[PDB]
Ligand binder design. Structure first.
Ligand SMILES: CC(=O)N[C@@H]1[C@@H](O)[C@H](O[C@@H]2O[C@H](CO)[C@H](O)[C@H](O[C@]3(C(=O)O)C[C@H](O)[C@@H](NC(C)=O)[C@H]([C@H](O)[C@H](O)CO)O3)[C@H]2O)[C@@H](CO)O[C@H]1O
Ligand SMILES: CC(=O)N[C@@H]1[C@@H](O)[C@H](O[C@@H]2O[C@H](CO)[C@H](O)[C@H](O[C@]3(C(=O)O)C[C@H](O)[C@@H](NC(C)=O)[C@H]([C@H](O)[C@H](O)CO)O3)[C@H]2O)[C@@H](CO)O[C@H]1O
Ligand SMILES: CC(=O)N[C@@H]1[C@@H](O)[C@H](O[C@@H]2O[C@H](CO)[C@H](O)[C@H](O[C@]3(C(=O)O)C[C@H](O)[C@@H](NC(C)=O)[C@H]([C@H](O)[C@H](O)CO)O3)[C@H]2O)[C@@H](CO)O[C@H]1O
Ligand SMILES: *[C@@H]1O[C@H](CO)[C@@H](O)[C@H](O)[C@H]1NC(C)=O
Ligand SMILES: *[C@@H]1O[C@H](CO)[C@@H](O)[C@H](O)[C@H]1NC(C)=O
Ligand SMILES: *[C@@H]1O[C@H](CO)[C@@H](O)[C@H](O)[C@H]1NC(C)=O
Lengths: 145, 319, 146, 319, 145, 319
């Protein structure tokens, strides 16, 4: 699979069913509905997990308290660096699994149409399969159920 | 007849990062980092801050004549002070444990200033000549408003014995000071007595101060110095002063009427006639983002601060 | 494969072999023995990895040391929040891979009985396969070895 | 004939969480967080703590008469003090560098108290009239046991010059004090000499104290104040006191006999007649769990503290 | 698949093509070139991500500043332990995905030679496949293109 | 005919760890942790450190006679001091706010020492007898070089009034002290006047010191003590001293000529005649590794410190 389809507007994952006369796309609502839930749960988890995080406070020190002034500065910068790292890393982790989540679902949908029809159909590649009979728009939608 | 499976694509150029990859182009993405602020100091949830303008905390509390705007301020949400306020100790010197006082002030939202020793109550001392050109007001020599620089009267300075009992329900912030003169002649000229002291007592305070004569550089035109002190006088406790000279006596003191979350913010900005839920020293934030990178020192209901320049989540597929 | 089988008491992963007359379950000792090792190693790794962690100590300050008292409090709370986050996150990560580890092994066992018998058998689905001969209790156990 | 492949299931309702999922039911799970304690203060690996009851560290060390239970304590594992002990400085005042002393004390397991200056050795001063109603004992005026409040004798207070050489092998904790009187008349009434001092020297100490007269509120019935001081006198070093009044002299001092891991725990609990490997201020822990959430301030062989309410690992499959 | 082949010296992933007479190995440059890029990017990411990290500074305290001396020590040790943990954990994470990355690519190369030739060939196992004709050195290389 | 697919293997025994696995043998691996150093103190990017040898910072700055090697040092990259330098305060006593001075020093790369009060300028005091056997030099009693111990002359110690105006462009570090004698007889023997003071003033300094007589143990053969003080005198400001005894006067002071990144390193090592980009107190590092575990306190362009004993990345496959 080289590139994506610009034509597909409805959903994220879908079937491009092309009958003897007609030709058009169709989004898989069974997968796309479950996908919108998966993304909205992971984003809210990142929001809730980072609520306990360091809060810097202004402290003042005189000219002969330079050591503790420096200690204070180092300490507050220290925690801000730690939580910056945690936030950035968690985003990279969530991004990795989000893209793998998409590739997982696309390839699961490939195997769904392939595996369901063992002796009747054989997968040529890129999603598409073979048959011993022609397939009208009525037949095209039959693979879903 | 040929059905095939595939995924969505577009002409976007928004990019995200991964653990193993960087600058990956995606069809959809969700920014979660707030980078904008309004550039103004605002009310915090309806409550206006105390903006000290060109005055310091010391200038405000002691009553530097240039700081008369702040003689009786209303309840505040936070305090704003410039990095280097011009109106501080007009008469040069220092404020003892200043930083600890500021720390306490960061937990206070409102004072009620009251007169505890009337200026008119000093019968055997001169109470209306305690002024300096270091503390100008409308083109004339003046002084801090909330304390009184007493000097001798009819070539005499009788020993002062004065007490104030805190009959209020509130803790009381009390301020006083000592004058460190330039030389022995100045000492006798102002106070008559050559060797002096100030003693101060409460249930916890046990202070006896002696003036230090030294030859010092002019600051704001003066080589003399004033050193100021403070205590929290508890309800039903009393403060007792004794002195035969050099005493900068209390006139007004501050009842602590409301405590809560506050802060002293350092900022050069002025009041921006606005309201916010989240203030930083360089501007207010109004955002539903979980993170921001505006400034680490915030007050209010804010997103979490990070040092990141960019923080973008992947939502759609690769492009 | 919809749900699990309560009838299987012996092991975690196993075959439900049902002959012409009889019918009963059997645990895969080759996989189940390797699985108990995999779980016990990951749990001990979490125990050993978190041994270097912040230990709070009691410090006392007087009435005119409020700034450093606050500094101290903020610092100790700061580290406790950091390590709480690390502990909780590591548990979520270990849990994710543990459940994926189980699904991996169940589907590997599906492919084992399928792949081994290419031309002889064909997988109908849910584990079960096809044959051109009947299969007694003797035949049922033959798929494990050969 | 039909063989099929599957996995184990049961009727458990134990649940675990994942990054992407929450409240997932599993056949097996392993709790790794200890949430229980015994609610008692125990011996630590066979060694009993020093439980100060209603006494503070200052009350114990100076020998507040209400704290006689602690005149000669045995070796301890840790020290327990209440948040606000009632028996502290009976005669009001303060303990200089108190918090730094407590820090040292947190590294000590045992003192041996010794007499370094007998009360009977004061021939030219009154050593048996140094009492106050602020320090009651069995219905009468008394005083701290380990120091002595000297006053004048036959209307005279000769200059004291007294030295003690630490001929022991141990470091010695030495305590003394100064009395700050109410007024000049009280000064001459107790000590005869109107202008007094206390000088103290060792190889590192160079102290000269002067009493501060001030008018102060009554605390425990008294307006006078005592200020206490301490030093660690090294083996073979000597401490030299000189004074013409206001001196609260050492009688007893503490040899430091054992150092080790200790702590001062703040707790309201009493001794629980138990033994443990791990103590917190609200109870002891006996667990093989790697984590706990009881209290952050522990001593002994403990699990690691976290703020979590729940921490459960998946071991088995989904249910 | 029990072990690897020492005879393969050129690349990481490759085909062991053995004709009627000859017998030798050959590295897959299409995969091996993409693999060297994948490893060099992940190692540099670990270098760049950890640049903001705590830097301990020497501070001195006198004999009556023991509490803040202890505070300072605890604070600096605290951050060093935090960043030691972060560094070690990130290495374990990168190692896990590196080994899975290798297993992924080896099994993808198995399916490439299998899937490409559906009706013509059938996979026996361990990479190797079947045919209805003999296969010389010329035929052996034909599976790549 | 049989083509088959497989992966590379070798006879290596290098092992790596994973989250779920440990001691996994691999064909290739990349070490990313530096464990070696050269065991020497080196120049930092061409600039040599100030190695104090057996002298402390106090010994250097005050001019302990044993520290003459450091009377006028060139620009340094960092400072090295031993844990317990033998040459510190030869005459016993203390250095006020010593640690804060060291902190300032950690931001300075070069001083230029100048004479501000000539020893020859004391006409009515003895300026050449201020020596002690506690400060030996070439077999005779001597003293700190940069300050002067004045005593009486012809049985008199007139009141000193001396000012120095900082007419330089640089901030000036100025040092002075007070002598605490052994007894009243020693006081009159050295200074004639029984009751003395030192007052010091600048635009910010307002100091009045009084000597403390106490009976003290001998340190370096002496029971007397010297207490030293310092200030930063700004350009165009002046420092004014007044005293009738016990004054240890400035002679030389330090112009601050260059500020920058520095540090005071504690180390027992000597100069190693080398150059490096990265120094630790136990040795220099020359590495392209991202991490090291040599020592947490480094200066220069260094890898990141971790406590790990081993840190190895997987690059190749399983073996
Ligand atoms: C070159 C020369 O000799 N000029 C003097 C000139 O200095 C002097 O002015 C007075 O100098 C004195 C110090 O000696 C004070 O600085 C006077 O200033 C004031 C002030 O404004 O602060 C005046 C004020 O009236 C005084 N207030 C009180 C309550 O005493 C204060 C106060 O004494 C000091 O601040 C205490 O430290 O000082 C300043 O006018 C003139 C006038 O005498 O004579 C020249 O010869
Ligand atoms: C309303 C009125 O005038 N009442 C006085 C009443 O104050 C006075 O009581 C005595 O007052 C003095 C203060 O001037 C002390 O407070 C006395 O208390 C003691 C004490 O218990 O602490 C008595 C004790 O014997 C003294 N001990 C020594 C060693 O001197 C101490 C000591 O002087 C002070 O603590 C030092 O500051 O004080 C208190 O009894 C009564 C009786 O004289 O007379 C009323 O008129
Ligand atoms: C057993 C006995 O009594 N022996 C004394 C012996 O102590 C004494 O030695 C002198 O003792 C005095 C103390 O009273 C000083 O310690 C003398 O030391 C010096 C010093 O080297 O520091 C000598 C020096 O010349 C003095 N310098 C100045 C500027 O005055 C200093 C200085 O006075 C003190 O350091 C100030 O604290 O003291 C020490 O020689 C001998 C000689 O008198 O006589 C025995 O009887
Ligand atoms: C203050 O006044 C009240 C009421 O007169 C009195 O009870 C109290 O003792 C006074 N407090 C002090 C410290 O004198
Ligand atoms: C105390 O006594 C010992 C033993 O004689 C002696 O050596 C030491 O110098 C004395 N210490 C002091 C400070 O006098
Ligand atoms: C120092 O000297 C300059 C120039 O002579 C003078 O203007 C300045 O006021 C002096 N500073 C002080 C504090 O006297």
């Amino acid at each position: 699979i080289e590139g994506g389809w610009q034509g597909m507007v409805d959903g994220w994952y879908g079937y491009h069913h092309s009958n003897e006369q007609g030709s058009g796309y169709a989004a898989d609502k069974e997968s796309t509905q479950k996908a919108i839930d998966g993304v909205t749960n992971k984003v809210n988890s990142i929001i809730d997990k980072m609520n306990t995080q360091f809060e810097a406070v202004g402290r003042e020190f005189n000219n002969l308290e330079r050591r503790i002034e420096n200690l204070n500065k180092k300490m507050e910068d220290g925690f801000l660096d730690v939580w910056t790292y945690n936030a950035e890393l968690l985003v990279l982790m969530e991004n990795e699994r989000t893209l793998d989540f998409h590739d997982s679902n696309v390839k699961n949908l490939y195997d769904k149409v392939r595996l369901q029809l063992r002796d009747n159909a054989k997968e040529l590649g890129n999603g598409c399969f073979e048959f011993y009979h022609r397939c009208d728009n009525e037949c095209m939608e039959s693979v879903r159920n | 007849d040929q059905i095939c499976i595939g995924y969505h694509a577009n002409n976007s150029t928004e990019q995200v990062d991964t653990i193993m990859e960087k600058n990956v182009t995606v069809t959809h993405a969700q920014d979660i980092l707030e980078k904008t602020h309004n550039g103004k100091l605002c009310d915090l949830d309806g409550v206006k801050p105390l903006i000290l303008r060109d005055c310091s905390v010391a200038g405000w509390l002691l009553g530097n004549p240039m700081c008369d705007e702040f003689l009786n301020v209303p309840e505040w949400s936070y305090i704003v002070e410039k990095i280097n306020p011009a109106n501080d100790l007009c008469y040069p010197g220092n404020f003892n444990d200043y930083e600890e006082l500021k720390h306490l002030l960061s937990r206070i939202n409102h004072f009620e200033k009251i007169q505890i020793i009337p200026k008119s109550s000093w019968s055997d001392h001169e109470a209306s000549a305690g002024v300096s050109s270091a503390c100008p007001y409308q083109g004339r020599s003046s002084f801090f408003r909330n304390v009184v620089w007493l000097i001798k009267k009819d070539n005499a300075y009788p020993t002062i014995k004065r007490s104030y009992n805190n009959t209020n329900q509130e803790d009381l912030l009390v301020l006083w000071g000592i004058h460190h003169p330039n030389d022995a002649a100045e000492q006798t000229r102002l106070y008559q007595n050559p060797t002096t002291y100030i003693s101060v007592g409460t249930s916890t305070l046990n202070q006896r101060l002696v003036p230090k004569i030294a030859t010092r550089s002019k600051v704001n035109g003066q080589s003399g110095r004033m050193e100021f002190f403070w205590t929290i006088l508890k309800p039903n406790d009393a403060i007792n002063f004794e002195s035969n000279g050099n005493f900068i006596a209390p006139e007004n003191a501050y009842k602590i009427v409301k405590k809560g979350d506050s802060t002293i913010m350092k900022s050069e900005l002025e009041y921006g006639n606005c309201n916010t839920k989240c203030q930083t020293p360089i501007g207010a934030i109004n955002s539903s983002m979980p993170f921001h990178n505006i400034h680490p020192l915030t007050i209010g209901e804010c997103p979490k601060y990070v040092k990141s320049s960019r923080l973008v989540l992947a939502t759609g597929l690769r492009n």
